[PDB]
């Protein structure tokens, strides 16, 4: 299970809604989201309905404004409870379709290029667990939730480029 309370206004003010599960469409309920309290679960907030647009990873804790989840705006129109995983393993590849140099991680990586000297990651195999891939180092820029499965090209994880600077496990 999980539980998040979404507030329209900064600092946990305004109209609010308590969500226990995936909600593909917040628009009837919240016209904006400027703070959130995550009681439990790892959540992905989405700028757009039906889990599209900019994605923001949130874990347990309180966020007094949208900048605290790296939000570019107060637009939150869907949210997903990310399934718990008990282990994490990801392979990153230089080229598409699992070709070229590969590196395999089981831990968080704040600076990819420190370990794998490629600015671009063209395919990846998420063998175990859910991960968040970040465009920039130190968990900045655009975020992309990765669930277990095969990603033969960067389009498969919802990005418009292959730039990857950091990545983290979805874990408590």
Ligand X SMILES: *Sc1ccc([N+](=O)[O-])c(C(=O)O)c1
Judged by the rule CB under 6 A, the positions of this chain that interact with ligand X are 17-20, 23, 26, 29, 40-42, 59-60, 82, 84, 109-111, 114-115, 170-172
Closest CB to ligand X among residues 140, 155: 140
Closest CB to ligand X among residues 97, 124: 124
**Strand order across the 149-151 sheet:** 99-105, 89-95, 123-128, 149-151
Tokens 């309920």 label which residue?
29
- DSSP result, 77-94: -EEEEEPP-S--EEEEEE
CB of 44 to ligand X, least distance (A): 10
The enclosing H or E element of 5 equals strand 3-9
What is the C-alpha to C-alpha distance for residues 169 and 1, in angstroms, rounded to an integer? 19
CB of 67 to ligand X, least distance (A): 21
CB of 82 to ligand X, least distance (A): 6
CB of 130 to ligand X, least distance (A): 8
Closest CB to ligand X among residues 23, 142: 23
What is the C-alpha to C-alpha distance for residues 64 and 51, in angstroms, rounded to an integer? 23
Closest CB to ligand X among residues 60, 91: 60
Q: What angle do CA 9, 77, 42 make, to 5 degrees?
A: 85
């Amino acid at each position: 299970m999980g539980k998040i309370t979404l507030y329209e206004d900064r600092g946990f003010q305004g109209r609010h809604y308590e969500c226990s599960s995936d909600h593909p469409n917040l628009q009837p309920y919240l016209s904006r989201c400027n703070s959130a309290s995550v009681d439990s679960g790892c959540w992905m907030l989405y700028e757009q309905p039906n889990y599209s647009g900019l994605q923001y990873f949130l874990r347990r804790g309180d966020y007094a404004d949208h900048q605290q989840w790296m939000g570019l705006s107060d637009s939150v129109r869907s949210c997903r409870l990310i399934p718990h995983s008990g282990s994490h393993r990801i392979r990153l590849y230089e080229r598409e379709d699992y070709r070229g140099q590969m590196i395999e991680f089981t831990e968080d990586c704040s600076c990819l290029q420190d370990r794998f000297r490629f600015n671009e990651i063209h395919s990846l195999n998420v063998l175990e667990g859910s991960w968040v891939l970040y465009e920039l180092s130190n968990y900045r820029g655009r975020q992309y939730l990765l669930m277990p499965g095969d990603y033969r090209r960067y389009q498969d994880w919802g990005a418009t480029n292959a730039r990857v600077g950091s990545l983290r496990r979805v874990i408590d």
